[PDB]
């Protein structure tokens, strides 16, 4: 046994100037389950599909939409255990910020710290980059925020976006459906419709997970609320 | 295609070939056997004499790793010696921390996990040795464990490791060792060792014998010269028909 990891980078520059490992992590993301984020005028909705491979799976056991703080929520597309690592790190970073400043971390600050961690894994010794893309929602200063953080460590602010399978078509659908001044209920309907575009089979209140962020904070929708929204559609 | 070079790499079939190559190193060594009777454990090793220039007892493959625990090894002797040092350290630390003799099952688990720690990394090499641990106590009885280069530890009634372990296991199966005592097991062990030796392939060999049980007051020790000579005579007589 020897606990020393490799000290050389596994992500290096190709002769054409590209870091191919990050592009392959992006391919892993593009093979993931569809995720949608929509920033309404008074909140953000994050909707993902969780279609289990069997009825033997307990749907309630694992969650893909996760709280980071009382005001920040997370969802991902890509590889789930990498996502768990990043969720744990984001919660710890938010807590450290709260310990220093005694106010909840602004969404942009937490996005920056998480993206910094992802960049570290694009450059440090003996590791591969994370194989996930994160959608991060938050409410700060009476304002909703929606960010996407990629495996390279680059983050973007979005009004509405999609990740995972069929995300190009999802983006086209969003940009031909999204408008400003939208309310949170209509954004929830639009997010569920965007999931429905790429969904295969019947969508039920257990096939999808929905989280919302507004002034009251971030919370996961119970399957009963999701069933009500699906009935409305 | 380059999948067999590190213990930190899985082959496409799900195999770690470096551990299998270490096991092959064990399969080329000479045979050691252990037999667990109702009142003890007896170890017999066929120690090949490579040079007549060597002394008797050189390169011994039987070790005392604790007052109550003996060790029979096969494979790379230097690896086996380092593992015997590891086992001694584990036993001594257990006595220092918990205040009594380490149970054989616990010592086997600890050493097996130490061995398994060398099957995960490219920075180290798996051990090229397998071994048996033998112990006796009044509270726990007789116990015989075997550990291989992968780190798998199992309890046995009889065990063989080395070049001819299948023929030795066949010979061991013919024994009613559950009701036997150490006295007659020593003869049976010597007979099996003399049977599995190949005089054409290997010229000469010494017969190393040890035991632990109620006969020795729960102390692992070399079998005394009288019993060893009697067992050797009986084994030689059994060879002739």
């Amino acid at each position: 046994m020897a606990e020393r990891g490799y000290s050389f980078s596994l992500t290096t520059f190709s002769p054409s100037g590209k870091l191919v490992q990050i592009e392959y992590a992006l391919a892993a993301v593009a093979g993931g389950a569809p995720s949608v984020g929509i920033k309404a005028a008074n909140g953000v909705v994050l909707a993902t599909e969780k279609k289990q491979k069997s009825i033997l799976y307990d749907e309630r056991s694992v969650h893909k939409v996760e709280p980071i703080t009382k005001h920040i929520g997370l969802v991902y597309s890509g590889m789930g255990p990498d996502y768990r690592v990043l969720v744990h790190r984001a919660r710890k970073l938010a807590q450290q910020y709260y310990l220093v400043y005694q106010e909840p971390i602004p969404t942009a600050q937490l996005v920056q710290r998480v993206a910094s961690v992802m960049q570290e894994y694009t450059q440090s010794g003996g590791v591969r980059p994370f194989g996930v893309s994160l959608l991060i929602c938050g409410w700060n200063e009476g304002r909703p925020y929606l960010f996407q953080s990629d495996p390279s460590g680059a983050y973007f602010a979005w009004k509405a976006t999609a990740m995972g399978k069929n995300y190009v078509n999802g983006k086209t659908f969003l940009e031909k459906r999204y408008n400003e001044d939208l309310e949170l209920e209509d954004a929830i309907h639009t997010a569920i419709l965007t999931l429905k575009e790429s969904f295969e089979g019947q969508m039920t209140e257990d096939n999808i997970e929905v989280g919302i962020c507004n002034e009251a904070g971030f919370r996961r929708l119970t399957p009963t609320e999701v069933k009500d929204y699906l009935a409305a559609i | 295609t380059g999948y067999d070079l590190s213990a930190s790499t899985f082959s496409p079939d799900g195999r770690v070939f470096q551990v299998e190559y270490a096991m092959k190193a064990v399969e080329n060594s000479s045979t050691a056997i252990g037999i667990r009777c109702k009142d003890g454990v007896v170890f017999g090793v066929e120690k090949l004499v490579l040079s007549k220039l060597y002394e008797e007892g050189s390169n011994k493959r039987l070790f005392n790793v604790d007052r109550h625990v003996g060790m029979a090894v096969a494979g790379l002797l230097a690896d086996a010696r380092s593992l015997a040092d590891i086992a001694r350290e584990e036993a001594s630390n257990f006595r220092s921390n918990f205040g009594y003799n380490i149970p054989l099952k616990h010592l086997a688990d600890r050493v097996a996990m130490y061995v398994h720690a060398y099957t995960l990394y490219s920075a180290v090499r798996p051990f090229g040795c397998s071994f048996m641990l033998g112990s006796y106590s009044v509270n726990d009885g007789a116990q015989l464990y075997m550990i291989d280069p992968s780190g798998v530890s199992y309890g046995y009634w009889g065990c063989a490791i080395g070049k001819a372990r299948q023929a030795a296991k066949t010979e061991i199966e013919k024994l009613q060792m559950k009701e036997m005592t150490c006295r007659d097991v020593v003869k049976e062990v010597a007979k099996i060792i003399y049977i599995v030796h190949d005089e054409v392939k290997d010229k000469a060999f010494e017969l190393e014998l040890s035991w632990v049980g109620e006969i020795t007051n729960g102390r692992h020790e070399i079998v005394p010269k009288d019993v060893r000579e009697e067992a050797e005579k009986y084994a030689k007589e059994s060879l002739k028909e």
Binding site: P67, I68, R91, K92, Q95, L99, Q102 | -
Partner: protein, 220 residues
């Protein structure tokens, strides 16, 4: 400082005075000594105020991480264990004396925690310089399975005894009632002391103060 806590039939009542003295001078007339740990767990603090604030903030942060990870409500025993292990590792150098009270799936729990890392699980506790007066009130008047109003009156009486007999305690009485269904942070619960009414009018007029130099910077 006088802090106190009782277990009543439906939960916990915590109480504290609100005076913070620097030496023998009142620095803060309205000091908050009942600290949030979790929505079901609170802690009153005595001793070194900075140590108390920092320790409670750290444990509250760690318990928030723990409850996010488990998705379950925090237990009072977990807060107690974290606090006592942290305080013991510092060998009494962190001077936090704590009354930790909460209601979890196992029911109401009340602990006293001392700066060296020892804890006591008790049905009523007092702490601080007024702790003996409040304890006298408790030993005179505590009964098991009190109602919520009875428990609030008893804790306010204990805090008042600390306030009116310990020089280091004073001002207002703050309460925190915790049950499985609600949390009432009553601040102030009582105001037994007020500043005396002014009989005169000090001379304080524009132009009274002579000025050497003046500089006005306009802000955009």
């Amino acid at each position: 400082t006088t802090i106190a806590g009782v277990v009543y039939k439906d939960g916990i009542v915590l109480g504290a005075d609100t005076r913070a003295t620097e030496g023998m001078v009142v620095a803060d007339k309205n000091c908050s000594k009942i600290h949030f740990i979790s929505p079901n767990i609170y802690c009153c603090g005595a001793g070194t105020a900075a140590d108390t604030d920092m320790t409670t903030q750290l444990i509250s942060s760690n318990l928030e991480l723990h409850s996010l990870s488990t998705g379950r409500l925090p237990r009072v025993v977990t807060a107690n264990r974290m606090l006592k292990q942290m305080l013991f590792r510092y060998q009494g150098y962190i001077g936090a004396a704590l009354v930790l009270g909460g209601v979890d799936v196992t029911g109401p729990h009340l602990y006293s925690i001392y700066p060296h890392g020892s804890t006591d699980k008790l049905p009523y506790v007092t702490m601080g310089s007024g702790s003996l007066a409040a304890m006298a009130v408790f030993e005179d008047k505590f009964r098991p399975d009190m109602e919520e109003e009875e428990a609030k009156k008893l804790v306010s009486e204990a805090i008042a005894a600390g306030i009116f007999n310990d020089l280091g305690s004073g001002s207002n009485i703050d309460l925190c009632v915790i049950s499985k269904s609600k949390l009432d942070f009553l601040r102030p619960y009582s105001v037994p002391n007020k500043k005396g009414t002014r009989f005169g009018r000090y001379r304080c007029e524009k132009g009274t103060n002579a000025v050497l130099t003046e500089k006005v910077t306009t802000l955009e």
